Amino acid sequence: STQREYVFIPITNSITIDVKITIGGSDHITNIDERGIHNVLVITGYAVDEKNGRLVPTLDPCDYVKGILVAGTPQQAQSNDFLTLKLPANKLYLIRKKGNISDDLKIYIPYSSPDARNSMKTKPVSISDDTIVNNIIKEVFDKIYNITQKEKVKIEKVKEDIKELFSYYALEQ
């Protein structure tokens, strides 16, 4: 079947080694071709866990977290800590669409229990200090999309939309 993994895009990156698949299939969902990034997904009511960031289920509708979808099951030491879903490619909160999917796609998101021993007081975070932008270019936009700098010299436009397309809520604690 089809399976994707949602990768958070915060300014704090354990984003390096948590999943496996880099190519996996003949196609992906999130694309960066000639006009910016495409099909960026957003999850509302969640916040990242920036220290080794995972999606933490809050329930305030204000708190939201954006990330990109790349195929793969996470490192398969799992099925206890990450959330597994099965959505018909239309309930997804895809931002900047170009083309849709087969109307059934399985999603893996970095999940954890909401940790009922601390007041989950979240805070909003953007992506500035473009050194961070360069390291995330190196850490997913190079690992996953190594098509960049070999095919796409549109790095200015994928720099200026990271500061535009990705802003989230973290715990800061």
Place this chain on the structure above:
Amino acid sequence: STQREYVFIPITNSITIDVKITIGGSDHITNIDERGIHNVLVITGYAVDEKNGRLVPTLDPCDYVKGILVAGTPQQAQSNDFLTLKLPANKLYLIRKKGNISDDLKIYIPYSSPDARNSMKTKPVSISDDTIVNNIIKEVFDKIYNITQKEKVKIEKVKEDIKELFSYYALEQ
């Protein structure tokens, strides 16, 4: 300190054995004070699973479940299904905010695993068919809110709204 339970309101009689405490502390978040419901809590991105009804997480902001916040602990028959969390009392979307808060509350919402073996395409459901309204008064508003039959003769005051507010979404699978 202070803890509550989130009791969502479906058409189903599948919400009977949900309780462990009647009052516990000295307060209920939700109020029914001579005008109807108050302080109703909404959780978006979640669809009910009326098949032994609990909340199932989706990835759609158009999916949402309304309910009430009763004081207590869930059943003692848990630690595998529900999700407890501590929130600073302002990260709750409260419909009909009547009073104030205490700025940190622990809550239990009835959670169910997403069950990624069928496409979880859900559809909306509004609570109509007032006989279920008149028996849900019995079920949830006469086991906990025994003010009904005590002082409040205007129970049609809550019929008018249970037939008009407490809607939700459901997998219908």
Place this chain on the structure above:
Amino acid sequence: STQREYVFIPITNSITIDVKITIGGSDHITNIDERGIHNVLVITGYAVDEKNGRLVPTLDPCDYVKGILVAGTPQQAQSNDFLTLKLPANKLYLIRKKGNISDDLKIYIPYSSPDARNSMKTKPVSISDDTIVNNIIKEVFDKIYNITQKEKVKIEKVKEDIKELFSYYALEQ
């Protein structure tokens, strides 16, 4: 058993030796750390007795006298003319309070007879004329505060406040 001793700061020579102990424990009430004098004390209703330096009880609330609470007890040739006192540290009219107190202090006040043969017409006096200021820089702020010129290279700052802070009313007869 922790006691203290109140010593006043007049414009005359009645201070250089009045007490036995200066350290006693490990921390003076009044401190001078990078900002000037702190934990100054004021007693409301007494006037100075510069000739045989002591304090005389007046019933006027508009009357007040400045002073420092130094650790110690006077010279063991005393205890017949000094208002020693037990106070729970909240009856103390401190100034520039920095740290919490032990909530019980014994205080040796330089006390004088009411000298009941003259009406106590007391004139207000401030402290200036840097001659005696530089006298007291070391005659009264070194034997007790040998921190002078070792860590507080800014002992002009411990002047920067006596320019304004200390003042009193004296009989001047």
Place this chain on the structure above:
Amino acid sequence: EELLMSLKLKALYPLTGGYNRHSINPFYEELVRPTEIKGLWRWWNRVLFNTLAYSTKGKLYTYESIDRLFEDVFGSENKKSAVRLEVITDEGNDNRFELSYVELDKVIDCLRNYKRKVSLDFIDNTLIAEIEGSTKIPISFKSNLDIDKIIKDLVHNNKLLSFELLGFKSVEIDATKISDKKILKEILRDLITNYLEYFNIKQEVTFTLNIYLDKSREHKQNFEDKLKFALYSLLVFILLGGIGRKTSRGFGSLSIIDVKCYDNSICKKIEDLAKNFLKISSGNELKSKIESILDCIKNSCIDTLYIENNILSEIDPKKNVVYFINSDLFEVKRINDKEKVLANIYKAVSSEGCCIKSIITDKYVRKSFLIAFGGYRKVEKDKGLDIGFIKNYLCETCETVSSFNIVDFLLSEGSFMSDYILQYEHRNSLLRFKLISDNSNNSYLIGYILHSSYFKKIDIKYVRCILEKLTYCVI
């Protein structure tokens, strides 16, 4: 855009006014007005900023320039405020004044064909309707508000309240010409509503003040420090001021119950500094805490960082009047009874009050003192006592026997400040009183005197122990 902090406050005997100058009306009840909180926050912020600017540079800036400097947090005609206030008064659901019935048709009888003044009085526990045409009919009525029998006494005893009650008490009805009964009924009905709403005074109004912050408004030049200064000003407002009417006389006094930061990097030095007021054992401890906060902002805290911006504007000395805090004048005494304290404030601030009579003699300076420290008063040139004498006790030239000389107050040469001091009706009082409580049952009377800019270097020593004596006599 995001909740910044949350302050559970408590006001005692607030005299909040709405469109009818009362806390309740036929349509809603409103004990705390967020617009009043915002306006008083800005007023205290300007006072605190001139305080700072005068304790470092000896300069005083116009209110225009100060608010133009802070328009990045408080907003102006050119920019939306970055802070959003949200009052949540618990129990704040639908309540309004309803006059279910009033049994007139007997007052209307004794009114026709005449021109009489219909006075009211609500002591005796029954509403009477005095008529200056020599009759006093007791009125039967039923309202929705239950005047607790403590409020009637609080209003009848406090000479200030019963004074501002003259305006809500009477009408001069003229029935000489064509005068039906129905319109007289509506006249007296609205008069009774206007009189009864005045007694909606509650004790211990408790509300939660949320503060939201727009982050989108960036750190343009000095946003973070401006915001921190504004939060300090808000704390100083909660500590020294009140909400509503006659806060200069103890009413509406505020008190902290709980503060909760939500953005440590901005307010975590206000959170604890307000925690510094949840428990106040003695008066001296409180005076010390107040001097601590006051000094913190004076030299130790932020700096002259944004005062170096060239948008401020020094005040003209003879055409402007601004106020600022003076750290010396901060008497504190333990209360033991709030109602009696509020009632004795009149002894403090009235020219014939038996506390300032027992603290000041010659009466002239007395008038002078109050005229310089009790806001506006109605003095008029008829019987000599104003002639010269009080003009003398205010000359900036001409003697030093009075410790207060108004800047441009001249002997027969009054140009601006003379009219402002003697004629301008809306002048706040510099001598102010406040009442505080903590989570414990400790209560304290602050009496302070804001320093003004029309004082030609006032003698800070004479008025200082005038203030302790006043604070004693009224408690």
Place this chain on the structure above:
Amino acid sequence: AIDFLVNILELIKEKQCNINLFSAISLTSIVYNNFGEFLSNNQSYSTNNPLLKYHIIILNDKNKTKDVEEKRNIFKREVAELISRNFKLDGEKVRNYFDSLKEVLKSLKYTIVDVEITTRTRALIGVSTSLGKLIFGSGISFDPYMNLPYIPASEIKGIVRSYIEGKLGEQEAEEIFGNEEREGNVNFTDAYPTRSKDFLFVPDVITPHYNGKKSEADAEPRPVIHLTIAPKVTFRFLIYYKREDVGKPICDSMPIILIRGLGARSSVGYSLFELRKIEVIKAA
């Protein structure tokens, strides 16, 4: 004619939802702006016109122009109270209008999203619009043919769009609402009050003391009696579109943006709303 003017207050009191409030307030503004003249034996000598009692009250017998000034201030307050009390909501025509429009939009194959929002505090929408402007100097956005206050579709769209900007970027905001080169994909109707618990309008006041003032010498209160929209008034509006993959942001944006203000002076917590209901009808 002039008798219309002397009777407009009686008509307000006796119709209460069936006169044109816009023209009624416009006409009584003539009375308010010639108050001293309508009180010189030119009250038509009626018996119900509220202008009578201003001959019975003696506010200042010394100077007559001051007396007329105080009577005029009292009359302004009384007009505000009159409108707030008598003009109430009858939102059955509104429910009919929205149901018929929903059927129209279904026949046009739109996906309709009908949203009910309740005001939580006193709201101010269209404070610079003309309604009571000639009496109160402040207005309310008022449809004079629905005879109701309303929230313009353009304000709702603008607030939703600024939130969607602030969240998903200007590029997604333009992919949804369009730009100078592409038209928007989401249509908004005006919002009308469908139900209320009590009064539809209520009086209020704002009293600037230190607004554009040099110093305390410039300080003076200038109170401004004006009308606001009472709390607990429910408004209803529609959101319709064709492209399905535009309902997700709308869905998300509605609950949040109403907590924050929706009309004027939300900075001091006036125009706050609760999300009462959201129904979505997919074109099948």
